[PDB]
């Protein structure tokens, strides 16, 4: 009949990141409060109009923020860090919590498994109370533009509390918030609201299973206290846990993710559990950038419609997690661009899906399938790659046998010193080549490489790196020369505060075509007698940082990339580079939300790592760096990698992170990060030696390397040089044998 379409949220950035410019200009004291709010109002009415014109029946209002949607609630609900208690509650206090001012900023955490970061609330003695009418104002504003189509959105109490810190008693904290939400909801209804989106994504997670009863209590409360509201129990990022129980919640509608929770939610509904309820079906991928598979999606929608009292079509999650629009991506090949969909294009998609379901005829529907079909048939999605059956997935010799061979070639001292690869980048001004001969740019880079070689040689580091001055991003630097990769001109996505990323797109089969890092590495090696490490990026980081294809399985993509890394590695080795390092920084973000699904992921990663590194000679030393804190869960996978040396970050834990390696009696090489690289502070000589010796408690000294926690690209040069000089701390422990 008449199928509604909606959306959970929308980006704040604006087509050209004007949002970013506005607020960064405000912090710099370059924008008055008046222009700040007016600027933000312009953006909001703009976004509301786009969504209106797209045909949405329920338009999300409330998710727009000047920094973070969790921070919004903290300030609105009076959950203000103790240290900020005496400050007037206004926009300046708001940004002080987000950024610090006397007082440090609140901490941020990853928003579930996305690349977005929220601001962690800090609970204490102060009682919750409504400090403003943030959401009501936004609602009434929206009404003037879109009318009864305005749908207020907000993060629910249960998720909010679970995402917080300092909470002593979970249920008491939740309960204290109920009256606030009640008034908020009551006012909204009085102002004309009917449907209200209430985000409880905590109920797609393992931790969620602890809060099933709270959910029943909390939402029985709302149904009783605000009977006229049509609540949408909104979830996303995975399937609904304990669907059979949660489906009994006294709400008018459930928001289910059929993109990242397809199997679980599809079986949840096949049960007929939602037959008497309305389903908000998240059928459009809200955190990837591919035009929908219409045949697949529409078929799924029919199945959902038959198993519900009512259906509203929307994306799987807020459009916050994708770029704004493809309309100005003019560098793209038409067949690709026509098969791409960013936020704005998804609004159009959701509308067309609803009209097809209602039996309306639209030429755009089949045309969309035509463009989709053209993409799948593109030559770049049909590249003939290397036959994997002829690729080594294990090295000819075991760790033991390789260690001697490598030791006999390298003759490295006990507790060798080295760095993770990157040095401070002063030049970004030079990189303006704008226009400037490639020869000048290269001469410039090579000059800076030689300079840090001498530095390293004077610090007396045992294994040198070139500095990666030529690299602005550890992922895009590789995708630039790999087939199947592309970059966008304007595809920015907010990560935290005013910071945003422009992820590369993996649109076709990945294939190594030309040397990517060889020139710089070889040149560094030609300047010193000391071993120079090669630095590459692994499949985990590459796929996690990029927008990957969804038309092939994770493992297939991973293996493709592995082959590419193998090919690069072969070039490096042929050119005489004897120590090669594979960098992985996104394991924390790449690891699936559900524990039960994490092994298959790690398995895939381990295999792709073997594909990449098993074709080197036994004398070639393979290192891998992994940005990670907790190793207790994945130590099996790590041993499985069979890396000659894995460099880990221990400084923050004073080496206690070695624990998991101790219990597992890890036999392979380990690099000990003994200095926090994210702090401008220069560690003490005693602070470092103690950090090195802790891991020497049980495991043999012959297994360890000494190095900073991570790359030094973020740090300044002076503190870096001093911090590295450290080598003395290493030389000290070596002295006392
Ligand atoms: Zn790291």
From Swiss-Prot:
Domain of life of the native organism: Bacteria
Any GO MF annotation of the entry: 5-methyltetrahydropteroyltriglutamate-homocysteine S-methyltransferase activity
Cofactor: binding details: Binds 1 zinc ion per subunit.
Cofactor section: Zn(2+)
Chain sites annotated for binding 5-methyltetrahydropteroyltri-L-glutamate: 20, 115, 473, 496, 499-500, 545
Keyword line: Amino-acid biosynthesis, Metal-binding, Methionine biosynthesis, Methyltransferase, Repeat, Transferase, Zinc
EC number per UniProt: 2.1.1.14
Gene Ontology BP annotations: 'de novo' L-methionine biosynthetic process; methylation
HAMAP family, per database record: Meth_synth (MF_00172)
Sequence similarity: Belongs to the vitamin-B12 independent methionine synthase family.
Protein name, as recorded: 5-methyltetrahydropteroyltriglutamate--homocysteine methyltransferase
Organism: Streptococcus mutans serotype c (strain ATCC 700610 / UA159)
């Amino acid at each position: 009949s008449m199928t509604k379409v909606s959306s959970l949220g929308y980006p704040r950035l604006g087509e050209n990141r004007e949002w970013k410019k506005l607020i960064e200009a405000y912090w710099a004291g370059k924008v008055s409060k008046n222009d700040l709010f007016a600027g933000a109002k312009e953006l909001r009415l703009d976004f509301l109009k786009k969504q209106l014109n797209a045909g949405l029946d329920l338009i999300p209002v409330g998710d727009f923020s000047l920094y973070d949607h969790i921070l919004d609630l903290s300030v609105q609900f009076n959950i203000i860090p103790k240290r900020f208690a005496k400050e007037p509650i206004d926009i300046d206090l708001y940004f002080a919590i987000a950024r610090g001012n006397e007082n440090v900023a609140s901490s941020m955490k990853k928003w579930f498994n996305t690349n977005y970061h929220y601001i962690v609330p800090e609970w204490s003695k102060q009682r919750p109370k409504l400090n403003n009418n943030r959401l009501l104002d936004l609602y009434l504003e929206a009404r003037e533009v879109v009318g009864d189509k305005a749908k207020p959105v907000i993060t629910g109490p249960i998720t909010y509390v679970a995402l917080s810190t300092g909470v002593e008693d979970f249920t008491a904290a939740v309960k204290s918030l109920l009256p606030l939400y009640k008034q908020v909801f009551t006012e909204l209804v009085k102002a004309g609201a009917s449907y209200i989106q209430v985000d409880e994504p905590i109920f797609v997670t393992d931790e969620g299973k602890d809060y099933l009863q709270a959910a029943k209590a909390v939402y029985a409360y709302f149904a009783k206290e605000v009977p006229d509201a049509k609540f949408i129990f909104q979830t996303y990022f995975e399937g609904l846990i304990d669907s059979q129980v949660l489906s009994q919640l006294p709400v008018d509608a459930f928001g289910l993710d059929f993109v990242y929770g397809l199997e679980e939610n599809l079986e949840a509904i096949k049960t007929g559990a939602f037959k008497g309820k309305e389903i908000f079906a998240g059928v459009i991928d809200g955190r990837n950038i591919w035009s929908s598979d219409f045949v697949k999606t529409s078929a799924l929608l029919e199945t959902i419609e038959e198993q519900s009292a009512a259906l509203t079509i929307q994306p799987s999650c807020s459009l916050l997690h994708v770029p704004v629009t493809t309309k100005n991506e003019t560098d793209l090949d038409p067949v690709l661009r026509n098969g791409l969909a960013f936020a704005d294009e998804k609004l159009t998609e959701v509308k067309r899906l609803a009209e097809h379901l209602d039996g309306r005829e639209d030429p755009a529907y089949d045309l969309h399938i035509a463009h989709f079909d053209a993409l799948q048939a593109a030559d770049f999605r049909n590249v003939k790659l290397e036959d994997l059956s002829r690729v080594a997935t294990k090295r000819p010799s075991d760790f033991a046998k390789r260690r001697d061979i490598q030791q006999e070639k390298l003759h490295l001292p006990l507790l060798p010193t080295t760095t993770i690869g990157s040095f401070p980048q002063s030049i970004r001004r030079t990189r303006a080549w704008g226009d400037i001969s490639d020869a000048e740019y290269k001469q410039f880079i090579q000059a800076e490489i030689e300079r840090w070689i001498r530095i390293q040689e004077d610090l007396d580091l045992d294994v040198l790196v070139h500095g990666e001055f030529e690299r602005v991003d550890m992922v895009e630097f590789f995708g630039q020369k790999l087939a199947g990769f592309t970059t966008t001109k304007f595809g920015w996505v907010q990560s935290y505060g005013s910071r945003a990323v422009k992820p590369p797109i993996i649109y076709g089969d990945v294939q190594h075509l030309e040397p990517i890092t060889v020139e710089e590495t070889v040149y560094a090696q030609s300047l010193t007698d000391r071993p120079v490490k090669g630095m590459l990026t692994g499949p985990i980081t590459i796929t996690n940082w990029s927008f990957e294809r969804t038309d092939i399985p994770r493992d297939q993509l991973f293996n493709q990339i592995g082959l590419a890394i193998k090919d690069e590695i072969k070039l490096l080795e042929n050119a005489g580079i004897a120590i090669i390092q594979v960098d992985e920084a996104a394991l924390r973000e790449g690891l699936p939300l559900r524990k039960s699904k994490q092994k298959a992921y790690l398995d895939d990663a381990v295999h792709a790592f073997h594909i990449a590194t098993s074709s080197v000679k036994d004398e070639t030393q393979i290192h891998t760096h992994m940005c990670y804190s907790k190793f207790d869960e994945i130590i099996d996978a790590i041993r499985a990698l069979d890396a000659d040396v894995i460099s880990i970050e221990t400084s923050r834990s004073h080496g206690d992170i070695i624990e998991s390696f101790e219990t597992a009696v890890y036999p392979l090489g380990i690099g000990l990060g003994v200095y926090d690289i994210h702090s401008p502070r220069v560690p003490t000589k005693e602070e470092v030696v103690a950090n090195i010796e802790r891991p020497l408690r049980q495991l043999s000294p012959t297994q360890f390397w000494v190095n900073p926690d991570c790359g030094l690209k973020t740090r300044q040069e002076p503190e870096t040089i001093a911090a590295l000089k450290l080598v003395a701390a290493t030389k000290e422990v070596r002295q006392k044998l």
